[PDB]
């Protein structure tokens, strides 16, 4: 599930030499996880934020949904004020240790 | 349909002046439960009774103050009045009157009676004096209904009339508050078994069993003679 | 009065100061919603005095909680009623207990 | 101990009596115990938390509704809030609110 | 009453401008002008707006299009 | 300090002014009606007269039946009788 | 990044808390910026310039023009009490942990807001470019772009 | 004024006339503490004689209220927008899984989870045990007798 | 007022089959609907007249672990088969019943001679399942006449599905006539069987407690 809701880059590969399992630009939308599984492929190279070359927020294609949304996140939604909320929302934590 | 058999009634037992037990002819299977049932939410939810629902005294105004001689004050007269049951005849919104002075124990036997109303228990306590030049005078206004209605409900009813001096009350008119059915089989040997069910029953007083059961019959057939078309 | 108690509502309730109590009482004489008059024997009377013991009671008032106070009466009439007993019940009292 | 004293009242000691429907007038499986509470009635009143307002007279300073239910007030909104309802991302709710 | 919004959904896609749209469109309706092309059921204007974009007749361009249509009739 | 008294009562002529608001009138009709409510007295009466308030409006369009109209319009309001 | 996603995972796993990452690298980009430099790089000899207005710089700068000059920097992270004060809005920060002194640094400089933080549209009281009104901000945008 | 005194009067063609225009209208509800972004939801408001409003309990769970005392306030929608966002984004039909997560935020965990293991369980073999049937006949038997 | 109370005139009702059908009702005094639709599902549920088959004699073991000997299917599955069959007889009573078809493999109503009195609302009912070769096979069945529904565990030896219901739900909502809101709205769903069209069977239970409860009243209303 780290990986689930995330688009990886060219480096994935199959474990046969020569061979490859995923295009570049994809999402790990429900089946691919499976067969992932198969091959016990440990090491994927994903995009991520701040990586992604924009200089302003963060360029859709290395978010995916993380939402109520079976479909990739749409322009012009703020991520930010999604994030820093959900963190602290488990206010159930432990103090004196 | 196949020899249905319908029921009669039979065995109408006086259990006391307001218990009682009524007993039902044996009828086929699965229906003694939902007859039951109906039959006692019918006679618990819609029947007729007698209530009052206004009272007016010379002396006292509202109902947060006192009077000179009593012990108890008017809130503990209004709830042991709301207490009181009663039968009146088909006339209904029917006032009386209460008077009395000395010591003694009020009761409702020293009431002026009318060939109308007929009380059903004159031991009830409406709050003894203390004093002897005491005296009470005051009229209660009595009606007939079918469901619990608070004060609040008959306000609308009087916005130029309830003058200082006349406390409305809740009416409830629930006159049994309590029953309960049983059924089983029995008196059935040259047929296939049978249940009976029996009903019993605890009221006011202020009604009869028989009347009240054929009541429900009626209402519950006015009910279900809409439902064939 | 409540069914389950623990014994020291009754306690509570007297030592609140919220109900009437007799003291240095014999007999009650005359019995108001809101007036108490009880006669003292002459045991625990002293001469000087008429030997009459008045109360009256606090009828409907307001209070810092904007609720109603008003204390009931107890005894019926006639009845010998012994020094440091209760009179009258005001509110959630019963019968010297407090009865909320 | 509680057990003998609900053999005296005839009662069984499990304490578990079957019940039937008010409505369907069918009998419950797994006999439910019953229980006589000494409950009490809190302060906590409805009537006094009842409290809305749709448009009434504003402040002289910052020209805002009044507030907390003096003289028919207004409920106050909270950053927090809007914060919420960025994340949401409805704009126009937010200027409805800053302006209407 | 829509009790939810999913064939606009894909309708429109981006869940943003499918709003603006729905918007426009209602407060041409109430300010009134044409007689609404869906079958009315005694509703709201906001969803026979719904509805109708939902039958795929409605979008950002047919609008502006009829809105140029009657500008150039004046 | 923190405590301010935060009181604007409409004072009737706030009334006025949301009952014209409120009130169909032409452009030219509701300015005749502001400054009719600008020239009311406490007590409940107009101030200057309607020669004069004519004058005041200062346009040839503007007729004495206007006013007359404006007035009868002043006179449809709550309370009766108005200016 | 990887060693506090780990951090802070463990941190929530051991309640049993789930929560996606990517939210936690949010805060990291939020939390990585204001790169300090060492070469000046023709564009300036100071300290503490955001990791995007030196890349675009260098960007429009190096293989634009002048690939020669270039600036070797070091990205330095600030903490979230520090980080949040480094705004180019004086209006944002404000309300975050003082007025005063920011109104002082402000009015010293002379710098202007352009109301390009939500929290800029929130005060004024006009639509965010975010949601429903990220479209009309667009558009604003492009218009004021040809006016 | 005639409008304003037949609605202080509260005529009953003032109930009907108010009963039509809540028909067709959203209405959004916000809990005072607030954690995440779902502590506010949009439903269709429906009259009931009372004083308190009657929240869906599976709702209560991303409230995190707990039905002791406790406050709720309601917002109302003007601007055709206004409502649009609140059908759109503001609705609990759209709100099932968390944002943060991923998980649905919907989850009965109260007597439904007890009575779901109730109905579908067997001590050894209930009255019927051996019956063979098409599954319609299931509650026709189970409510009569026999099983 | 006094004994006064409201009468449904909204009968409209709505049918996604032949066999299905929901029924919902005006506003109604309180509390009388649920008591209404708790009787009226019961009777239907309890004693509705009608035919059913009790018991089939096939050829072979009379045991329920029969063999298939080309059916390649358990008689169990053949008496599943069979339950939900809606028989009608107008006025014969207890009649037997046989089929014999060639080894074709659909065993349908068809495959069952046609008496007298003896109908099938549906002959294109599967019997048993598709066979292997050419052989044939006998039913020696027999509808009963009777009401409601009992297991043949009881009374033997397959079941007796008297009542000709499949599924019936009814729910009460909340109404309001004028001004109180304490009024009691019906809903009715009713699936049935066959043979009988679902408010006609509404109406023969109404009059089956009717004229249950008609004598009860001892002649009133009548005039």
Known sequence: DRVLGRVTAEDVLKPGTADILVPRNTLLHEQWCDLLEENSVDAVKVRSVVSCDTDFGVCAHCYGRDLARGHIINKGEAIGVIAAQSIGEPGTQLTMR | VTEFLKPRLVDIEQVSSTHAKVTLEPLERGFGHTLGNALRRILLSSMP??????????????????????????????????????????????????????????????ITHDGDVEIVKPQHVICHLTDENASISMRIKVQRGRGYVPASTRIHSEEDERPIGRLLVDACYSPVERIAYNVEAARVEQRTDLDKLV??????????????????????????????? | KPLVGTGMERA????????????????????????????????????????????????????????????????????????????????????????? | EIKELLKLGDLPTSGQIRLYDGRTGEQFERPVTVGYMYMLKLNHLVDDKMHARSTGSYSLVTQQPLGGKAQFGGQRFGEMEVWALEAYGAAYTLQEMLTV | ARVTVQDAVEKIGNRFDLVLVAARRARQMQVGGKDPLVPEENDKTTVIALREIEEGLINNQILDVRERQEQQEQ | ?????????????????????????????????????????????????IEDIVDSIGDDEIGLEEVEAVLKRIQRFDPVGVA | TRYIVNEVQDVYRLQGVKINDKHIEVIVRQMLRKATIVNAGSSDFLEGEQVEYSRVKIANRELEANGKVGATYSRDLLGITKASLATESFISAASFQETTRVLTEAAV????????????????????????????????????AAG | ???????????????????????????????????????????????????????????????????????????????????????????????????????????????????????????????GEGMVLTGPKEAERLYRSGL
């Open chain 8, 1 to 127: 004024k005639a409008a304003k005194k037949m609605v202080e009067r509260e005529e009953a063609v003032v109930w009907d006339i108010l009963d039509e225009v809540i028909r067709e209208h959203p209405v959004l509800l916000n809990r005072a503490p607030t954690l995440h972004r779902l502590g506010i939801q949009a439903f269709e408001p429906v009259l009931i004689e009372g004083k308190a409003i009657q929240l869906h309990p599976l709702v209560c769970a991303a409230y995190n209220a707990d039905f002791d005392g406790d406050q709720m306030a309601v917002h109302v929608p003007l601007t055709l927008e206004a409502q649009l966002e609140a059908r759109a984004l503001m609705m609990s039909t759209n709100n099932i899984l968390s944002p943060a997560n991923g998980e649905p935020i919907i989850v009965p965990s109260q007597d439904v989870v007890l009575g779901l293991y109730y109905m579908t369980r067997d001590c050894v073999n209930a009255k």
């Open chain 3, 12 to 100: 509570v309730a007297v030592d609140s100061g919220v109900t009437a109590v007799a003291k240095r009482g014999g007999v009650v004489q005359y019995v108001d919603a809101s007036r108490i008059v009880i006669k003292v024997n002459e045991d625990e009377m002293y001469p000087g005095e008429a030997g009459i013991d008045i109360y009256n009671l606090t009828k409907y008032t307001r209070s810092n909680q904007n609720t109603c106070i008003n204390q009931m009466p107890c005894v019926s009439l006639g009845e010998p009623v012994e020094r440091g007993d209760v009179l009258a019940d005001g509110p959630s009292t019963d019968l010297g207990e407090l009865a909320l």
């Open chain 7, 109 to 144: 400089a002379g710098k202007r807001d352009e109301l390009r933080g939500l929290k800029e549209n929130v005060i004024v009281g006009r639509l965010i470019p975010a949601g429903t009104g990220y479209a009309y901000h667009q558009d604003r945008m492009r218009r004021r």
């Open chain 2, 49 to 110: 009774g007698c209530a009052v629902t206004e009272v007016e005294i010379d002396g006292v105004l509202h109902e947060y103050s006192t009077k000179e001689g009593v012990q108890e004050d008017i809130l503990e007269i209004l709830l042991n009045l709301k207490g009181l049951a009663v039968r009146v005849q088909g006339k209904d919104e029917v006032i009386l009157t209460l008077n009395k002075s000395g010591i003694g124990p009020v009761t409702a036997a020293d």
């Open chain 6, 1 to 49: 300090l923190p405590v301010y008294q935060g009181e604007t009562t409409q004072t009737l002529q706030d009334y006025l002014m949301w009952q014209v608001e409120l009130t169909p009138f032409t452009d030219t009709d509701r300015a005749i009606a502001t400054s009719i409510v600008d020239a009311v007295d406490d007590t409940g009466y107009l101030t200057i007269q």
């Open chain 2, 199 to 229: 009903i019993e029953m605890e009221t006011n007083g202020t009604i009869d069993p028989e009347e009240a059961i054929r009541r429900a019959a009626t209402i519950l057939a006015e009910q279900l003679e809409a439902f064939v078309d």
